[PDB]
Design a protein around this ligand. Structure first.
Ligand code: FAD
Ligand code: FAD
Ligand code: FAD
Ligand code: NAP
Ligand code: NAP
Ligand code: NAP
Ligand code: HEM
Ligand code: HEM
Ligand code: HEM
Ligand code: CLR
Ligand code: CLR
Ligand code: CLR
Ligand code: CLR
Ligand code: CLR
Ligand code: CLR
Lengths: 424, 424, 424
């Protein structure tokens, strides 16, 4: 029933938190540091703190809890670290800082050891605490199977969820993972902000400034949130149109080149990768628009034609249908739901029901426009009304999709999708 | 640091996509085809394309990327495929097309080889691309442990998420998996459509046609979406009633037979299996009803008694309570949330809070009916009003559930639930 | 192709359901009972029911499907259970009933056997049925690797999802797991109920009783659900304030003590652990408030100043912003979404956007209060209006957070967060 000894190199924040987590989870830790005299009182009395040359002798699994630039300080400990699993927990301060990942550099430093990458994601504060809602998954990568399984078992005993990802070819991925902060959302968010700013300025120029000399009824105790009420929906529908224009453009490139075995242009690849983020931003903005259209027009201050009844009911119904379809798409976007669906079912949901949602949203805007545009006042300052642009982009998307259904084009796109593209 | 060679049989769409994915993920591929002269220019220069008899010699893991009906074309390669892992990636065009699954048929063809089922779910386009939101899980089944783990490691190196499911007894399941398209939703969707059509026709006959001779105030510029506003809620509540009538009927069958060790009738089994789909359809229709009741009655065109204040506030509150409980049930229906809950907690949530939601919905409809039914006009054309049916079904469900609480019945149902049913 | 024999000890409800599940999943079961004459007709004809001393001879994996207090009845079968995997499926009737878990007690009883904990979560009715939406994950813990993997494979063949959690140090956790019923929700729910009751009584005393002698316009055909409309929002905002006051107090304790390596007081630890439950309760109550504010003020019975337009639009917009941020936080609270986010991204979302949501909610309440408080009538009965308390708690939270941004305090808190706390 003797506890298994685990070695740790260095005495820092991560070393102390790791030692706490190991001791609480039924382990015995041997820590090697340059000056055990200095670091001995830091650690509890059940921690055996000695020199570098001593800790390695009495352990098999060693956490290299030092920074990358100090790895060469372990050069003298080359023949002691023979056949001993070295768990590399290091992290970089910048994505792609070095030509090779930290684990591969360590492996090149110590050819005879068994280098296992892992435990870098935890923050030396989740190690001190118990289970945490973000830092409960640890990714482990080693080119040696046995050492990888030993480290996975160690992670299991430390109340973690081990995740196996390969043979140090994945070390770069799990070193870049702790450093990323919504990398795929930056582009969609910038696009949404740009669209919102442009439509805000368009409404300000057309709706307010052009009749401002006529009326001039607003001051700083007024705000253009009638304009944000006209800006959120257009941004949402434009984001949906951008979600599906990427697929249209991919089809166009495939038809033009004649093969699917040609890499898309880098901008098209980035556009295709962030379609989920664009769609979720569109759903969020559509929901905010629904909230505004419910709360504001019906407020207590708002209390201060049969064909019109027709129109109002009909485009409200179309908006509700589109919102329901978008809600289905967003629900399927949860990782568990997406993984629980076949690729055929997921493709049906996303592609088909999103195209249907875009078409229904186009009708929902189109009715409003149909009896808000024929009056020459709203065709103001030579500038089309707000709904005209929010129609012109989904119109392009929908006409493209319909073009893709033509028999000649459908046949030339099936002959590509199904492999016979251009034999050579 | 030499790359591991992986063999592939055949040169088709799947073979080419698989070769691309293998080469990009640090592998070396040897492809065997009938005519290497023909297929050599198809594949890159780092691909060794030779005959069938040559590729097997220089590899250990071989992807049998050919259709099932051509498996007998490998009969001559029986003594070369001795002890070599054969990954069967084949798929059928129809569920339960053949008496035995593809993997088992291959294993019977080659008794001495190690047959591993896997990689059929990916679509030869997710292999070409990177990570995909539906095709990132691969299911692997082999009756040999070592070969199964080798194939799982191979899937890990190919940026997939290996899932182990057994010993080729699960081959049929993961061959039917790529072919299913919402199999459990078909029944609930057909039931919902039937209910919606019946209630639409009922409202058309009662609300419109019966006084149509009296008024005749509608034309084709009118639509019965006052009727869909009366059809969505009834369909939602009826779907909930059908969700819980299945449990009531299962209890009735258990009490009648005296044991739980008797298989339910096939219709009852299918009803019990699709309870989740019926409940989610009910939640979706209830949410659509909430959206209609918010957007339509308050529209700008809609602008064109204390006990009544009482009633309106009270049934709105009951509707909100029921919607909240249904939202809790739907949130627990996510696979991650369901797996994160104990069976006791999940049972409490679903059973208890869904019965409470059904009861509260019954009250919410019942108040509306209580002061919309006593007037003889709404008891029109000898036909009960719309809410009467939406009450009569949940009333049956609730009276059944209350009957199940009787001391004699509760005791006879505990003596069953807890094992003492009928000893023999 | 001979089936693998699996032994089962005892003949009860769990034994029968387990035997059914094993037989259906291609196994052959040998059941040992005290009186095979009695239990033989219970089980099918393909089940070999014999004495205790006979079943062990013809099997290797044995399910000890008897209660803990009867384990000593297997004392005579000590030398027969040598090297045989014993899967302990037992459960306790109370959390922490015994000093050592059931699996560890069994292991102490039989030192020479290989004890594996598992299959306790399933309810002897999910074993009889097929896949179930709560009982499809089984947790397995053994201090022997090989036996643990054998039991995991057995669980895989039984259409389960094996989960490995360690070396019998996790046996207590997975014995307590079937017994817990929302353990972390009890405290937050009691707090929410207490807040709701207190604010209901406060509104009853101030809003109704104090002018009750003045007007007396209500009877039992009236209800205080104008008061629940004033109670739900305050409870939601107070729950959010309590969510973040825990972090403020943790920071205060860290600054006072000078280290993060000191355990928080038990009440603070329990407060910190249940922050997710408090936040989700706050989100649920905020959504119920949104539903009430939409449905009730706009009802058909409700149909029975430019700066005010200003105010109404502005605080509605702030409420919508806060609801959107809370929705983002709740979406990230799904286990799949939380596990799919880096700890940095999850920390950003939760901490930063929740503080922003709290600030925006404070403004949203504050505008309403700003032009509903300056009238001396609402400062009624020497008691502050309802919004004043719902402001005073988030005000304390926000001033604390701002204090944490002071340069001296920020520096003393970074010197703690980053390890240099108090060297010894
Ligand atoms: C609310 C919301 C949530 C969303 N969530 C997600 C999400 O979680 N994940 C996600 O990925 N997206 C998500 N999306 C976006 C969604 O994936 C896209 O809208 C949808 O995939 C577009 O379908 P498509 O037909 O344009 O593209 P696809 O079907 O993906 O194909 C794009 C292009 O590739 C071609 N192509 C397709 N299959 C093949 C093949 N086998 N061989 C050759 N060429 C082929 C098509 O012809 C087309 O030119 C979401 C969108 C919304 C609105
Ligand atoms: C929005 C929504 C979402 C839903 N999501 C899901 C979902 O994700 N998954 C899902 O499965 N369902 C889901 N449902 C449906 C839900 O499961 C059912 O409403 C609920 O289980 C019915 O409870 P019950 O008491 O009728 O049935 P159960 O408790 O399941 O039992 C049915 C019958 O079996 C008997 N029985 C139960 N336990 C035993 C036992 N141990 N031994 C012998 N007999 C027993 C009962 O007496 C009864 O006769 C959802 C419903 C809704 C509205
Ligand atoms: C709708 C909703 C859903 C929610 N869902 C969840 C959920 O799923 N999971 C969950 O956990 N919470 C959840 N929450 C609550 C959420 O986690 C908290 O609101 C948030 O974490 C508080 O941030 P903080 O800065 O106060 O605390 P934290 O950042 O967690 O830190 C608390 C204290 O620890 C200190 N500290 C932090 N990091 C370190 C460190 N490295 N070293 C030393 N000291 C440190 C801080 O200074 C502070 O004193 C939810 C809340 C809401 C409203
Ligand atoms: N939150 C975290 O801290 C965290 C989280 C994840 C991963 N990590 C990784 O874990 C490792 C430990 O980080 P840390 O925060 O603990 O680092 P730190 O506080 O900077 O500690 C540096 C450690 O390196 C040792 N060291 C050895 N040779 C050295 C040299 N020449 N110069 C300087 N130091 C030398 C020191 O040990 P002596 O006492 O013997 O000098 C000391 O224990 C890093 O690789 C980090 O990327 C940290
Ligand atoms: N999207 C997909 O394509 C996909 C996805 C998942 C699974 N799969 C499975 O993967 C396998 C490959 O599918 P595929 O689409 O690549 O098929 P395909 O395009 O029809 O190719 C058929 C292949 O079979 C070989 N073959 C051998 N003997 C043959 C014979 N007698 N008659 C005809 N062909 C013979 C051919 O090789 P030669 O050049 O030597 O003649 C050719 O490479 C199938 O089992 C399929 O079910 C495919
Ligand atoms: N839903 C469930 O039932 C469920 C779920 C999860 C886990 N479990 C666990 O699985 C085990 C089986 O539970 P169960 O519900 O089947 O129990 P049960 O109905 O009470 O059966 C008791 C069993 O213990 C045997 N036994 C041996 N020595 C005994 C003694 N001295 N006194 C009494 N019985 C003795 C009996 O076998 P003989 O015929 O030879 O006397 C009988 O088969 C328990 O440990 C339970 O915690 C049960
Ligand atoms: C319950 C669901 C919805 C309701 C009740 C609703 C309501 C409305 C209303 C009343 C208008 C008239 C303009 C205004 O009031 O400011 C409008 C316009 C608009 N709707 Fe919606 N909507 C819904 C969903 C959606 C969705 C999901 C989309 C797009 C994905 C969308 C796209 C638009 C657009 C772009 C406009 C712009 C028209 C203009 O600014 O002139 N709507 N909506
Ligand atoms: C915020 C939540 C809800 C609100 C505001 C609401 C509102 C209403 C209103 C105003 C009516 C009167 C009939 C009408 O206006 O067309 C009604 C009727 C009805 N409600 Fe709801 N409801 C809600 C939730 C629900 C839910 C969740 C269910 C069932 C699961 C439900 C079941 C019904 C049914 C069946 C009727 C039919 C009455 C009739 O057609 O005569 N309601 N609801
Ligand atoms: C769409 C979102 C929201 C809308 C439309 C809304 C609407 C309102 C309205 C109209 C009032 C005036 C008092 C009343 O009508 O009873 C109010 C008050 C209040 N709001 Fe909201 N709200 C929203 C979201 C929120 C959220 C998310 C919170 C807190 C997390 C919140 C906190 C409060 C509080 C505490 C009051 C109390 C004021 C009082 O009782 O005097 N609101 N809200
Ligand atoms: C993050 C996502 C949303 C980015 C999508 C933004 C779109 C509108 C941007 C991003 C990159 C852009 C492309 C970048 C480069 C070129 C080449 C030149 O001929 C101008 C047009 C063209 C082809 C641009 C078209 C618009 C474009 C595709
Ligand atoms: C929204 C838009 C971008 C959707 C795509 C429309 C355009 C780009 C597509 C639709 C029809 C396509 C054409 C269909 C047929 C041919 C004939 C052959 O020579 C291949 C290219 C060519 C000439 C295609 C070029 C691209 C094309 C013109
Ligand atoms: C997919 C789900 C929702 C199906 C539920 C539909 C219900 C209403 C249908 C489906 C199958 C049907 C049963 C099929 C067969 C019989 C036998 C005969 O005596 C008529 C009634 C009875 C017992 C039917 C009752 C109604 C029933 C249970
Ligand atoms: C909604 C409905 C279907 C719920 C179930 C109600 C009916 C079917 C149930 C409830 C009470 C049950 C009875 C309770 C007691 C007995 C006595 C004994 O001889 C077993 C059968 C019998 C006669 C049961 C038959 C089924 C029964 C009548
Ligand atoms: C389950 C969660 C929400 C519990 C949070 C409830 C809060 C308000 C309660 C729970 C435990 C309580 C603490 C328990 C003990 C003490 C010590 C004494 O000096 C009184 C105050 C103090 C410090 C209490 C302050 C309020 C407190 C922190
Ligand atoms: C909402 C509230 C609880 C937030 C926290 C505010 C209080 C408790 C915090 C904020 C500023 C803190 C002080 C900042 C600086 C010092 C000086 C040094 O001697 C450490 C303790 C001491 C004296 C701290 C004690 C705790 C403190 C006073």
């Amino acid at each position: 029933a003797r506890k298994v000894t685990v070695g740790v190199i260095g005495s820092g924040d991560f070393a102390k938190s790791l030692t706490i987590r190991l001791i609480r989870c039924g382990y015995h830790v041997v820590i090697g540091s340059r000056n055990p005299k200095f670091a001995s009182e830091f650690f509890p009395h059940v921690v055996d703190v000695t020199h570098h040359e001593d800790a390695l002798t009495k352990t098999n699994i060693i956490f290299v809890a030092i920074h990358r630039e100090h790895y060469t300080s372990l050069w003298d400990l080359r023949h002691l670290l023979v056949g001993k699993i070295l768990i590399d927990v290091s992290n970089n301060m910048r994505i792609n800082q070095y030509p090779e990942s930290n684990a591969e550099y360590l492996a090149s430093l110590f050819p005879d050891s068994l280098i296992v990458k892992g435990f870098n994601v935890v923050s030396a504060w989740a190690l001190q605490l118990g289970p945490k809602d973000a830092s409960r998954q640890v990714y482990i990568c080693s080119n040696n199977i046995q050492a990888r399984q030993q480290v996975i078992e160690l992670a299991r005993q430390l109340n973690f969820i081990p995740i196996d990802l390969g043979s140090l070819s994945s070390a770069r991925e799990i070193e870049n993972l702790p450093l990323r902060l919504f990398t795929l959302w930056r582009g969609p968010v910038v696009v949404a902000i740009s669209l919102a700013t442009f439509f805000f300025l368009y409404s300000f120029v057309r709706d307010v400034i052009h009749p401002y000399a006529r009326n001039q009824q607003s001051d700083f105790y007024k705000i253009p949130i009638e304009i944000v009420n006209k800006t959120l929906p257009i941004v949402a529908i434009t984001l949906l149109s951008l979600v599906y224009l990427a697929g249209l453009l991919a089809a166009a490139y495939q038809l033009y080149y004649g093969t699917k075995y040609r890499r898309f242009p880098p901008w098209l690849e980035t556009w295709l990768q962030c379609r989920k983020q664009l769609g979720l931003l569109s759903f969020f903005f559509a929901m905010v628009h629904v909230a505004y259209s419910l709360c504001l027009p019906m407020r207590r201050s708002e209390r201060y034609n049969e064909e019109e009844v027709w129109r109002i009911e009909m485009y409200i119904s179309f908006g509700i249908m589109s919102l329901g379809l978008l809600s289905l798409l967003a629900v399927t976007s949860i990782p568990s739901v997406s993984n629980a669906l076949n690729w055929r079912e997921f493709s049906f949901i996303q592609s088909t029901l999103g195209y249907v949602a875009l078409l229904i949203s186009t009708f929902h805007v189109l009715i409003y426009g149909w009896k808000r545009a024929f009056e020459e006042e709203y065709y103001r300052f030579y500038t089309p009304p707000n709904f005209v642009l929010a129609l012109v982009l989904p119109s392009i998307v929908i006409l493209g999709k319909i073009i893709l259904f033509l028999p000649c084009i459908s046949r030339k796109l099936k002959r590509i999708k199904k492999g016979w593209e251009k034999s050579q």
